[PDB]
């Protein structure tokens, strides 16, 4: 909430989540804030996911500002445990990253835009 500066329309969210599962089978993804973080740092990040229900918030506060100075596009997920399930994990995940999608690029490509457009 303190690091959330724009709300992602329920449906737009679905699209992002869909692209993730497909990217988890066509290409590569990063589960867990630590790995996500290093991606944004090692540039190897296309699109990153951040949950809206995380406590403590410290764990994620840095994602936005960090991404916003590395070009890497990022979108918000409302529930932490859907992101986990999407990434392919039993448990939930605070934030994940899509490293080289796969058959999800067009979608992602547009999501990246769709969001930029959502400011």
């Amino acid at each position: 909430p303190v690091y959330v500066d724009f709300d992602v329309p329920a449906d737009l969210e679905d699209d992002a989540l869909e692209a993730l599962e497909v990217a988890r089978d066509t290409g590569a993804v990063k589960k867990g804030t630590n790995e996500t973080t290093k991606s944004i740092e090692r540039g190897s990040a296309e699109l990153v996911f951040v949950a809206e229900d995380v406590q403590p918030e410290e764990i994620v506060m840095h994602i936005p500002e960090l991404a916003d100075e590395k070009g890497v596009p990022f979108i918000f997920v409302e529930q932490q445990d859907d992101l986990g399930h999407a990434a392919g994990l039993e448990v939930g995940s605070a934030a994940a990253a899509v490293t080289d999608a796969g058959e999800a690029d067009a979608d992602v490509e547009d999501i990246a835009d769709k969001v930029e457009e959502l400011r």
């Binding site: 290093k38 403590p56 410290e58 506060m61």
Partner: protein
């Protein structure tokens, strides 16, 4: 590359700046309405917790503890005292608020033992510290190498004997040389002069 953690940490260098500032201005509110000892499922400072011995495992608990701010709550003398000993206002306790917190917490969880603790802020009248505790009886811990040590009998009630880290520090045991003549190997063995 910088671990994700390193950010959580760097953010607390100045708990009164940016996001962490507003975050505190918000939490403390829900905090000032919580109890004395509140078990919480996740550490507000993951870097620190993990650093001090935390581990998202079983038998590992955390709890936030508030303690009043200020000097000792002392009662004036009701019998003869020489001037030196008639003080009240400026007398302070020899055990830091952090240690006070580690104890209030440990007592709330009789079966557990204190592993460590760290600060998490303070408003105008109180201080909050989060305390990491351990179920010395859980097999998940009895089998973890980086922790099973705390199961030893001689580790029982360690916080009340000052074996905690904040304890050994508050005991003047930091330095190994000059200055620690009356602290090591023990305050009491040095006739309480440190």
């Amino acid at each position: 590359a910088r671990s994700a953690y390193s950010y959580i940490r760097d953010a607390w260098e100045n708990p009164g700046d940016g996001q962490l500032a507003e975050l505190q201005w918000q939490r403390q509110q829900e905090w000032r309405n919580e109890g004395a000892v509140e078990r919480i499922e996740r550490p507000t400072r993951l870097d620190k917790a993990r650093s001090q011995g935390y581990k998202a495992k079983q038998g590992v608990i955390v709890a936030r503890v508030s303690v009043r701010k200020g000097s000792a709550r002392k009662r004036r003398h009701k019998a003869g005292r020489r001037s030196k000993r008639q003080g009240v206002t400026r007398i302070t306790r020899r055990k830091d608020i952090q240690r006070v917190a580690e104890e209030r917490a440990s007592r709330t969880f009789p079966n557990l033992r204190v592993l460590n603790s760290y600060s998490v802020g303070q408003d105008g009248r109180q201080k909050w510290h989060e305390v990491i505790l351990i179920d010395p009886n859980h097999p998940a811990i009895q089998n973890d190498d980086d922790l099973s040590w705390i199961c030893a009998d001689d580790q029982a009630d360690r916080v009340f004997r000052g074996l905690t880290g904040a304890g050994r520090r508050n005991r003047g045991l930091s330095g190994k040389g000059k200055g620690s003549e009356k602290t090591r190997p023990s305050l009491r063995s040095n006739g309480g002069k440190g």
